[PDB]
Amino acid sequence: FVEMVDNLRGKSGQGYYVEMTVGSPPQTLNILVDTGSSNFAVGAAPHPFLHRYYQRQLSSTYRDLRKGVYVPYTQGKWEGELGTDLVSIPHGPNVTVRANIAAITESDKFFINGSNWEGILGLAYAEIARPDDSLEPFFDSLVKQTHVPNLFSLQLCGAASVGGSMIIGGIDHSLYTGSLWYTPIRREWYYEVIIVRVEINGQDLKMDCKEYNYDKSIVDSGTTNLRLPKKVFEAAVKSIKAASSTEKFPDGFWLGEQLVCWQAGTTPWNIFPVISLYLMGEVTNQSFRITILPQQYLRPVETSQDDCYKFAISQSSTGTVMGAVIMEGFYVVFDRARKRIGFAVSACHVHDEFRTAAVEGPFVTLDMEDCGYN
Ligand SMILES: CCCN(CCC)C(=O)c1cccc(C(=O)N[C@@H](Cc2ccccc2)[C@H](O)CNCc2cccc(OC)c2)c1
């Protein structure tokens, strides 16, 4: 689908956006791609951080729906006015749909100063769409009204600016190597999945696997880090710290709280451990794993003029989150038509000489559904 190849742009830590058009004639907006939420919301007022915004007065195709919406994310908040209008995606499929659109009229800590997107495309399921599930997420409208197959895939790169591909309706083998392995979407709300084993440098964390998914493990392009649940994080960092005892760092650093720096020619990569998450496979008692490097969890922050990095694993309280730390390692297929998410080694994932991100199977794991949570 070389039409859609390379249709995602971004800057480090400001997410990935796609161009879309809204209303007739078409207003062009840069919309953040987010599998972590389910609302298509766009700036409709001249906030000073925005390059552009939706002007509903300019579109003959606009239809108020005389309802207001609040949408609070973990990080952020916006208030809006619900309507509908016609939505195309220049470098996606060649269609045009009547999608719901929240017109953002008030926001706090939502938009990012210096960024180049003006909206957010929530690609997850109605069950978390605000204000309630009657509000039909864009992708559901897209499928319900076109013949575009019920799936999309994401190749998030990031070599300053990043890039990538959102293939809508399909998959493109030029974007990955090896085979796609698939883990079932456990519930259609977020893209929730189950992690059944966690390894650092090949060494199990001998932990009840129910912790790994407490109370959720989810796939979120709208998030930067790998977010391990509090106790698994406490324990994850414990072995990460211990495998990388070679060198010393402040304890705050691991809690996020301050960069750490090195030489512009060699950093100690071969000195932090690869991380492996085993994920529920498609078959009774079969799992597989995805393995990331530190060229994923140690990401640059652009006093400094040396090849430097931040620690990108952090704690949470609404689950595990496989943000871009994970996603940038892999080509990820959101197979909604089959209640399942596929991972394959990404063609662009940034590695080194020795190691590499991998996707491997099958493995034998008993009692995978007990790793879940109710
Ligand atoms: C995305 C680029 C960098 N950012 C945003 C800057 C703060 C992050 O790395 C980040 C960090 C923490 C949390 C979030 C976040 O809340 N992401 C949501 C999408 C988003 C919002 C604002 C700006 C950019 C991206 C994402 O939807 C969270 N998924 C969980 C969730 C919680 C509550 C309600 C939900 O759906 C209604 C979803 C993003």
Side-chain angles (χ1 to χ4, degrees):
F1 300 72
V2 300
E3 63 212 82
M4 320 201 205
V5 169
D6 213 23
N7 64 356
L8 295 187
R9 279 289 160 285
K11 340 285 152 120
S12 186
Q14 315 203 145
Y16 292 82
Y17 60 80
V18 69
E19 202 184 75
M20 312 176 73
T21 62
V22 177
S24 332
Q27 293 160 62
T28 305
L29 302 165
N30 279 336
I31 305 313
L32 184 109
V33 166
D34 176 34
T35 66
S37 81
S38 314
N39 281 87
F40 178 30
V42 65
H47 188 104
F49 292 179
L50 307 181
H51 302 257
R52 41 202 100 72
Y53 52 91
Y54 184 37
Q55 301 188 285
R56 295 164 288 170
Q57 78 266 19
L58 289 179
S59 161
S60 42
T61 27
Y62 180 69
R63 285 172 198 171
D64 206 329
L65 288 188
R66 325 273 321 290
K67 200 189 285 195
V69 214
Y70 169 77
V71 177
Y73 303 104
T74 45
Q75 203 152 170
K77 96 90 190 164
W78 57 268
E79 184 176 55
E81 289 165 4
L82 283 156
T84 69
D85 205 332
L86 318 179
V87 184
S88 153
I89 311 195
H91 312 289
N94 210 86
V95 287
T96 304
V97 6
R98 170 157 294 279
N100 294 338
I101 297 179
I104 294 165
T105 63
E106 207 206 18
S107 72
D108 172 78
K109 282 165 180 18
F110 174 69
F111 296 119
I112 306 186
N113 194 8
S115 95
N116 197 33
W117 54 269
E118 299 88 56
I120 184 171
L121 177 63
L123 289 156
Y125 295 103
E127 189 81 294
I128 59 171
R130 314 308 194 217
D132 79 280
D133 40 85
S134 48
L135 197 83
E136 124 159 339
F138 167 88
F139 207 86
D140 305 39
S141 305
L142 169 61
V143 169
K144 195 165 278 155
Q145 306 171 18
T146 57
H147 286 313
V148 165
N150 197 17
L151 105 151
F152 63 88
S153 59
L154 291 179
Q155 182 205 50
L156 308 198
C157 303
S161 57
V162 307
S165 325
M166 176 171 44
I167 313 308
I168 312 263
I171 289 159
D172 182 324
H173 201 109
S174 81
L175 298 178
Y176 72 100
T177 69
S179 178
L180 278 164
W181 284 82
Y182 295 91
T183 189
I185 292 170
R186 171 172 191 220
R187 196 171 103 65
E188 279 160 314
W189 62 326
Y190 305 75
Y191 291 105
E192 186 184 23
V193 305
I194 300 174
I195 286 152
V196 314
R197 177 157 168 116
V198 180
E199 261 175 27
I200 282 154
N201 243 36
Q203 298 235 230
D204 192 347
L205 272 57
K206 329 261 305 298
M207 204 181 318
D208 174 358
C209 69
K210 224 161 187 128
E211 244 52 274
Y212 307 142
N213 324 301
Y214 180 46
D215 63 329
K216 253 193 314 207
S217 298
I218 68 168
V219 198
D220 207 337
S221 66
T223 270
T224 294
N225 298 134
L226 205 205
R227 303 201 134 64
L228 308 170
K230 166 167 56 219
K231 206 152 16 144
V232 171
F233 165 70
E234 233 65 82
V237 181
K238 196 195 194 320
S239 172
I240 296 188
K241 199 186 294 244
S244 62
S245 282
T246 327
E247 346 260 310
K248 155 82 193 169
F249 328 98
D251 297 287
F253 155 70
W254 304 114
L255 267 336
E257 308 154 352
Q258 215 126 4
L259 168 88
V260 44
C261 267
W262 281 291
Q263 180 100 283
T266 296
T267 288
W269 287 130
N270 304 13
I271 310 298
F272 297 100
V274 308
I275 296 188
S276 285
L277 312 184
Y278 296 58
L279 292 163
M280 197 186 259
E282 314 190 79
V283 155
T284 311
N285 286 4
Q286 170 259 315
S287 73
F288 66 99
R289 42 162 198 224
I290 70 177
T291 305
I292 73 186
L293 320 171
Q295 18 277 94
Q296 263 82 36
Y297 58 99
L298 257 33
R299 47 152 227 113
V301 80
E302 292 161 0
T303 343
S304 97
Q305 205 178 320
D306 239 348
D307 286 13
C308 294
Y309 315 83
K310 179 189 196 294
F311 188 65
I313 301 162
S314 94
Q315 39 202 116
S316 143
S317 330
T318 43
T320 265
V321 190
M322 299 164 65
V325 155
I326 298 292
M327 278 189 98
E328 280 176 0
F330 308 102
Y331 181 58
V332 184
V333 172
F334 294 82
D335 190 350
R336 296 148 50 82
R338 293 179 213 286
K339 279 201 57 189
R340 71 174 185 172
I341 292 160
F343 286 86
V345 177
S346 180
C348 79
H349 78 271
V350 64
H351 51 299
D352 58 83
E353 219 53 28
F354 309 89
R355 303 202 269 187
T356 187
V359 184
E360 310 186 67
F363 297 95
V364 189
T365 305
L366 306 187
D367 301 315
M368 296 202 295
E369 252 132 287
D370 291 333
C371 293
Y373 172 70
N374 293 96

